[PDB]
Amino acid sequence: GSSGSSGTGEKPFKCGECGKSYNQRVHLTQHQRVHTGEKPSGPSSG
């Protein structure tokens, strides 16, 4: 079988990291935050 979800309508802005679109650009940039913040190192135990 093969299935997949997709947004309803169309937006000028879209997130190419997870797949979340937003009518406005202010609703996208504030969302991409979840894709930017962590660190590849983290709390190093010396």
Interface with Zn ion, residue 11, by CB under 5 A:
no
Interface with Zn ion, residue 14, by CB under 5 A:
no
**Bridge partners (DSSP) listed for residue 26:** none
Among 7, 12, 14, 17, binds Zn ion (CB under 5 A): 17
Q: What string of DSSP letters covers 1-46?
A: -------SS--SEE-TTT--EESSSHHHHTTGGGGSS--SS-S---
Among 2, 8, 9, 18, binds Zn ion (CB under 5 A): 18
Among 13, 15, 22, 28, binds Zn ion (CB under 5 A): 15
